[PDB]
Design a protein around this nucleic acid. Sequence first.
DNA 1: GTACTGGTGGTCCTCAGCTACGTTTTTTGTCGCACTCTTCATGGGTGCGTGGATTGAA
DNA 2: CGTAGCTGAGGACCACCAGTACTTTTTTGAATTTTT
DNA 3: TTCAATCCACGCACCCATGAAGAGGCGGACAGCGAAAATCC
DNA 4: GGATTTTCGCT
Lengths: 98, 100, 218, 346, 343, 342, 343
Amino acid sequence: GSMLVLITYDVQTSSMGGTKRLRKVAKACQNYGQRVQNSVFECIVDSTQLTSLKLELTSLIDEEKDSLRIYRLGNNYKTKVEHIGAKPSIDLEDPLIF
Amino acid sequence: GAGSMLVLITYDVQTSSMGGTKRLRKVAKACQNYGQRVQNSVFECIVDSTQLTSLKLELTSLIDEEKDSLRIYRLGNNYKTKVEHIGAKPSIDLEDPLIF
Amino acid sequence: ASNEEDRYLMLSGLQHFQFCKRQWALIHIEQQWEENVRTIEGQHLHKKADQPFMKEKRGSKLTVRAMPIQSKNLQISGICDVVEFVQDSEGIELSGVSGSYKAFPVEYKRGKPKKGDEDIVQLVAQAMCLEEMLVCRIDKGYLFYNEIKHRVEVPITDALRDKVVQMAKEMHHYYENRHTPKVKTGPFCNNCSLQSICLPKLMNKRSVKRYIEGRLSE
Amino acid sequence: GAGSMKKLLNTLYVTQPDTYLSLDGDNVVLLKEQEKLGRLPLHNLEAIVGFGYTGASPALMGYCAERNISITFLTKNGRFLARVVGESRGNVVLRKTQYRISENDQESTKIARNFITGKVYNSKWMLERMTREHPLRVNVEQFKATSQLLSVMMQEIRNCDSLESLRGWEGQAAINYNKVFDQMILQQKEEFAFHGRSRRPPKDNVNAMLSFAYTLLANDVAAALETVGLDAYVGFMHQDRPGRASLALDLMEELRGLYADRFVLSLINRKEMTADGFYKKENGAVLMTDEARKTFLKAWQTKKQEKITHPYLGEKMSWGLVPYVQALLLARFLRGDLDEYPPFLW
Amino acid sequence: MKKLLNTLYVTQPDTYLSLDGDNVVLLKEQEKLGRLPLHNLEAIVGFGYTGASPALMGYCAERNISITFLTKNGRFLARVVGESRGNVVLRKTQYRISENDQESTKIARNFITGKVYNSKWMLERMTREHPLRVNVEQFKATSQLLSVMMQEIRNCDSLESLRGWEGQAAINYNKVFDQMILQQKEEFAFHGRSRRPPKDNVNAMLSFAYTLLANDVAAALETVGLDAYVGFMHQDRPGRASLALDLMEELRGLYADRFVLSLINRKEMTADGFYKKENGAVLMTDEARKTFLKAWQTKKQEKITHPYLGEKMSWGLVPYVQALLLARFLRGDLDEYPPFLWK
Amino acid sequence: MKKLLNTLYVTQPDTYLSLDGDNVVLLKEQEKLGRLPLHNLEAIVGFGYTGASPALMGYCAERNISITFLTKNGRFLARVVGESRGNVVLRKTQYRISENDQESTKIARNFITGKVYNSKWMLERMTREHPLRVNVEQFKATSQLLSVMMQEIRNCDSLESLRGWEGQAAINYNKVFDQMILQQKEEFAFHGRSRRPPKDNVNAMLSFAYTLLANDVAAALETVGLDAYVGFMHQDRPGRASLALDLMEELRGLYADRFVLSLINRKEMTADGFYKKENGAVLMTDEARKTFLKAWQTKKQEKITHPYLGEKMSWGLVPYVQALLLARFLRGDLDEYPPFLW
Amino acid sequence: MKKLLNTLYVTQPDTYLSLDGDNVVLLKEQEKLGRLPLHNLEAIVGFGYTGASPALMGYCAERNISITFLTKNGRFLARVVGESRGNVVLRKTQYRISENDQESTKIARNFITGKVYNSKWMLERMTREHPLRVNVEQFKATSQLLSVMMQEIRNCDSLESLRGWEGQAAINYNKVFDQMILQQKEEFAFHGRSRRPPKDNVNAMLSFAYTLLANDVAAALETVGLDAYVGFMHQDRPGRASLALDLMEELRGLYADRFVLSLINRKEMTADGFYKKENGAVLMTDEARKTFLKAWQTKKQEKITHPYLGEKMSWGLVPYVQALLLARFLRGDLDEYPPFLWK
DNA sequence: GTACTGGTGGTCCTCAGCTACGTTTTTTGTCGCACTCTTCATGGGTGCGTGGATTGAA
DNA sequence: CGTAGCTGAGGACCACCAGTACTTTTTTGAATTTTT
DNA sequence: TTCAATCCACGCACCCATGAAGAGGCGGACAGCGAAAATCC
DNA sequence: GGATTTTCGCT
Ligand SMILES: [Mn+2]
């Protein structure tokens, strides 16, 4: 439980009807998880929610035209994720004080 | 270690300022050296620990801080059962017979 | 006598010789080398923090880097990484610059301070080199530790001088008979970078003349 | 992993003709009349094998020579057409030791003893492994008789003194082992029946696979030996015919039995290859087929990743490293850290 | 373009190379520039970013011809060989000779005689050229001394004696060297040799030249297969190419000191390009270093004649051809090692 | 199950919570502060004047996520409650069990038994670690007399009796509370549990924690489908919202008083983190509030072992399980409610 | 909006409820559309995608006011309240009366009396409106029959009798009902009825109207605090909102069938939108259902007068307000529950 | 033939703004009672590092 | 106000195209508050 | 006369497919309703 | 004829 998975997508938006597909995929993949970078999302999900997300997302895209990769890490991602730049992102285990 | 991990790199440089095309080209060339690309503005590459340390050091010395972004993901050793592909962007795999 | 000056030994070899005692042997007799993560870190810091052709005439002190040193009493060549000249009345003048100062050598490593010898040894050698060039009184030495980002001063005593003289004599002797020695491996000698050729398990194991006849009985 | 000797990097086999191996930074790229066919990072390779007419830019070979990435060229049937060899490194102690030792016949015998001892032990132990698991098959006693014969011969070989005697005993063992090598067609028809040796044309089957196995093993032993620091063209045994990888042959004399021809026998007995794949020209000896070549190379690179435990060093290491660590266990005996070179006694 | 002693050097850069029939063909952007038979070649040496042609690669590797690919400045890149690799008996012969005094002293004699002859003839030539600014008597006295010394070294049989004679010859030439410079003596004065941390300007310059030349000669050896780290006069130690230093004695003077003195006398550079160090050491500026390298490259294209064989060839091939002759000494019909006796 | 989900705190005033798909976004005059996915939240708490989009309230109410509004000093206001989701037989049983004094006094028996057990055993534990600071003897004294009351509470059949005994456990423990502190006694105005709702120093923390717990247990109970802040055990008096916390009275003494005491003893809060108004009310500084909330979440994350089956469980699940078991007893599978006893 | 019943019924979309001093302000796109006091209100019901100013939420929470939020049409979105008031005692009373049978029989007989009154008067008006081609004496005889049945239902004491007289009334109604519609009588009427997947178009469109009234009544109950799944006349069962069904049967008169006849007559609906799939199923066409929903909204906008309260309102508020009176029955302020009754 | 620097253009992503709406829910007698959906918890593998018995020497 | 569709105006990523280039010292560098 | 590295079993530390509980809704078997329509007497 | 029993489409 509580896997921190990574989703990347590259949708061809300039073939026949790309813009609609890109917008729908962006909204769908922002429904689950959080924004990190252009065409790079991370989510904190269980197995069932991830399977549901994959089933929902494999239909909005149109195959043979675009690409979509899903990576998974495990339970102790704090040792794995490392950052150097200037695009900070919250980690959804902090005290979360606003 | 000597585990031959499959590390993932995401770089995000900014070309709207004085540090534009030069930085983008240099980062692209210094990241493509150690691995292939799977999608525009992302990279995956099989690496030991020492090469990864050299790569991370080079990129953290190359890009300008407070204006860019760089993320490194370490999947581990048993990686073949974690990468999941859906679309139609094939990528070569270097832990296979690899015949051309 | 250039050939006499030719037969000098790199100072880092003398630093290594206060260690696993084969690392120097591998690195200077068989001409082999590898690279661990910590070697990469140390090499990067040494490269970044050192650039020649520049000097800083602040007035309070004069710091010069990458200065070649060649001591003849010990037959040691090397490159001192930090030399600090400080205003003094009894010090000797430096060539090419007006005034007189006192010279302090400083070499900066990466890592926590070592409880035993290693570093200190090398530092002492530094002073002797200057003793054979600027011929003065060098009784102080600062080490700049990076993992803690601070300085530690170590006074120099003649016992360390005799120690390093005898050590350099033996280390120079080992070239005459190019015989790499052995020593107990211990558990510390893991993070060695030369381990892929060092082979600790091959040093304290039974002879092959037993194994090859044993499994041959059947 | 404790010793963590090295890591078994992969290997590239290019088969399509009229390509061109170019270099871009650290990447090897396969161009073909300006069309790009692919690119691979060069830190993830060990050797690159080319088939047919494949040219190389001087920058690429110059980059590959200095990092012990070997390059090999083959025409159609794994010939020794051309390799790449780099500069010489400054490790004169090992080379001086090797040349001086090779100048002394007594040390030549004291090394060839261990080489042939390992070889005959390999032969005997593999023969006994084959007998005990196939009860109802061949004379379960001819194999046994050859087994105690080889046990008898080995102790005597251990006690040899001059090179000619050791050559005689090696030949005796070779014939007395081929006598029963002719006996394994367990699960395939007569077209895989061994009927002797033909050198330049693989006029039959079995030879058309043993030749490929031997070439692909020689090109690995040579690379390992030139990586460790030794020179691989002067030998502790064999007649020193000029310009032949003599030390490579010496070091292969031990893993040939358990690493190449065992592999071909396993390939045949599992019926992973069919006699329809091969063909023949007007004379044409026997030439393999492109899908047949692909299957051979896939099975080879798949088996080269099995994890075993090494007898002497006592570590869990992959199969393909064995021709490397052995060489490393060899060039250190030269510095005197052991008593005598332990051959592989799987 | 040129074939010297059964070898083929292609010195002009950017010229592709291929096979036609049973001959080698040079090309430069689809323009036929040269055709040469391959019946009696022994090796091929390239300098350009050519790549050769795989047909010829297979052809030569089948016909016992190895290929060596360098870069246009002489650095070693790769060596394509088949089974033979060529240098096995030669390298064994070198290793066997490296551990005996008689043959090593013979070859050291061959080197040193050439060195002293070149030095003496250069001295006499400079006496002849310029009358007014010369102490003629000192040079003629040293010339007679050096002639007697050469005649003596011709009959040496022990390493220590030859080392002592080499030392005396070095002292003589060094005590003569300073007044050779005829311009800009304000800061360019020679008063000793200090290889490690060089001091006071000109010394450093000299050192740099040696290094380049050594590297050049080093690559030269690797062309033929001589093991660069096991010397003949100089004793072997790890990390140093002893045989390169043995070989580059005969070529040191005429090819490095002449170049440095030409740079100094022609006002090719000024002392403003040398920076200071606190202990008296001297270094070079990047602009000065690049000018030095460019001048070296340009001089490397000067065309002269070969004293021993006669072919008109560039300066840059002198270290290779000599080295080739060295190889032909180790296993061949050479009676004795021919030095670069160049008037 | 339900691994403890996170919780979102908002303090800065005049923000706005808005829905977008399954993400909650914070705006303030069209300035996107941040967006959080709602599939890994358990509750949302807001300070000051913060509004919510009615679509967001509908979404959270449907999907069992509790929205709560607060003001400055945790003064409870405007909980978000949804609808009736079914399992009508369970509500039938619970509504029948009430207004009948036998079952009511059984449940009161178990509740106050748990409370007394926790208080006594915690006091004995504290006198067991470091005996130099306080008088062990008297502490031990209190122990046995509470043990005495334990036998009495088990031999009980009337609710009207237990309330009286409550006072005893409410007057036989306060006399120890003032001696509970170790450090910073002179600075922290420490008059024991002598309390004042309009705030007279120290108890700011008390009230804060009380209200905090009250909300967690209310959400945990409503997830299963019953309401017990004024139910079968507690008095019918309106405005005495404690039975929901009486399910965790067993914990009210433990998980809130223990937290306050650990913060005080570990010298992690300084007296400059509080202030008093002109009239006399006492408030907490914003940085101190952030420190308190960080500590509260970090403590709630720590993982322990439950007595019942020992499956390795976390602290935030302590209220929830106490609700779930209360279901299984009302289904008739067990005999009487097993409370939480540490 | 603010009925005599202490609730607020803001129905116009996009109206921002906000707070001024101690009063509520209804903003209609940034101007002060309305202002109401809060001194005597008890609960607020809000339709439409809107908001509430957090000041209003805070002012309502403290002084025992619940803020219920629903959508435009009606689908209980959420409720906001502090320590809950007016739900625990009401729901416990609901369950207690659900346990017993005497009060349940009384309430069910009340509801059935309301239904029979409604249907009888509907027939009276139907025969008065069009006294040209209609069986007037037949409808009068049916009227007397249902008058006697109304007296008997008012004289009821047990459930069984209730369910029975229900069934009877139902058959009689189907019977007479076929002859009621005026226009398009020759189209697709009913001779048979299904409480399950229907046959005949009229029966299916009754089913759809029943479903819409179902969702409306469910929200009507949920917005006040009562349950859904335990009823008074209908017995309890998991998953069936029995109270919802009871209120459905009470209000199945003017609000459902009159809409049916209006859609059928006036030629506002055609036979092209009705289909058949092997079992009598009337698959509603998408355009047909769009028109149906638009007509339903339009009818909901129609103004009428409450028979009991007398205050003018919309049709869409007829259920909720009615259901709200049920709450005031269970709080002890009412003696009975007349939906449409003389008393 | 490479490595490095300019410039050009075509193609991916995210915010900004305008326009129209918002949600589409095919029954309901009661009574246990065999079925289905959804969701939480275990007896198999699969390693992955380690002390316990074994003897050839000092 | 949330949910959809529609344009737009940009900042990122990368594939090419073209034009002036191509050799450097020597020594340095980690280890049980973890190293597969 | 005790010894001094070696393998060797050996345990141990988690993971995972899957098989069985609560909430849920499904059709059947009796409850019913009164006429009617005979069904029979 | 007359209990009455079944048949039969609605809660
Ligand atoms: Mn340093």
